[PDB]
From a paper:
HU proteins are the most abundant DNA-binding proteins in prokaryotic organisms and play an essential role in processes of DNA replication, repair, and recombination. HU proteins are small (approximately 90 amino acids per monomer) basic dimeric proteins that are annotated in the majority of bacteria with sequenced genomes. All HU dimers feature a compact architecture, including several intertwined α-helices, two three-stranded β-sheets, and two disordered arms that are flexible in the absence of DNA19.
In the present work, we analysed the three-dimensional structure of the HU protein from the insect parasite mycoplasma [name] determined at 1.4 Å resolution and found that it has unusual thermotolerance comparable to that of HU homologues from thermophilic bacteria. The monomer of recombinant HUSpm consists of 95 residues including an additional Gly-His dipeptide preceding the N-terminal Met, which was introduced by the cloning procedure. The monomer is composed of the following three canonical components: a helix-turn-helix (HTH) domain, a dimerization signal (DS) consisting of residues 48–52, and a flexible extended “arm” region — the DNA binding domain (DBD) region — responsible for DNA binding. As is seen in all known HU proteins, which are either homo- or heterodimers, the functional unit of HUSpm is a homodimer composed of two equivalent monomers (one monomer per asymmetric unit) related by a crystallographic twofold axis. Unlike other HU proteins with known three-dimensional structures, there are no salt bridges across the dimer interface in HUSpm, although a larger number of hydrogen bonds are formed compared to other HU proteins. An interesting feature of HUSpm is the presence of hydrogen bonds between the β3 and α3 regions (Lys77-Asn92 and vice versa) and between the α2 helix and the loop that links strands β1 and β2 (Gly48-Lys35 and vice versa). An analysis of the three-dimensional structure of HUSpm demonstrates that residue Phe14 of one monomer is located near Phe29 of the other monomer, which is favourable for the strengthening of the hydrophobic contact. In HUSpm, this cavity is also absent, which may be attributed to the amino acid substitution at position 31. The non-conserved Phe14 and Phe29 residues contribute to strengthening the hydrophobic dimer contact, the semi-conserved Phe31 is responsible for the absence of the internal cavity at the dimer interface, and the Lys35 and Asn92 residues are involved in the formation of unique hydrogen bonds between the monomers.
Author numbering:
A (entry chain A), B (entry chain A): -1 to 93
The structure:
Amino acid sequence: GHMSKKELAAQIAEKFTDVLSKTHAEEITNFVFDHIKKALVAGKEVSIAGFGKFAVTERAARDGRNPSTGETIKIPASKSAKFKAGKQLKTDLNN
Amino acid sequence: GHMSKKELAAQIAEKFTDVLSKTHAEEITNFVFDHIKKALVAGKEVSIAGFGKFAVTERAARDGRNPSTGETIKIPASKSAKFKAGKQLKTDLNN
Ligand code: NA
Ligand code: NA
């Protein structure tokens, strides 16, 4: 199965209709992930208790070879973000 | 740096004070991740546009050996959840 962000936001809106509208639920859901992204972009690890942690990772630069010339190259570094599932999520998935 | 769930919820509360209280911001932030967990527990992939995707993964069972006896064992399967950062997050981290 699948659950999208819009579906998440719709569930928020349905379960918190006393708190906020469907439009605000979508705004806030978008803000959750935007803010998490902003934090990763700022180099922060984002820890979400009961859920897990996000950290920026960097594929390190390293020596390669030009295959044709056997000249030393640099394979460039690049960043990504990694999630490590927390203990509670791991427990819930293994029940 | 670090950003926790409480800090995320506090940012939500600060930036959406017209929408919800600090208490509700924490409730909703907790619900976001609880609901995502519920979806993974239900076997759903959770796709969050602009952010990335979570999927349940299973470390497959496989043959091991009892080291001492050379009897065939089974190393048990276990589930976890994996996140794959979306293109936009990858772009933002590499800017
Ligand atoms: Na609305
Ligand atoms: Na409050």
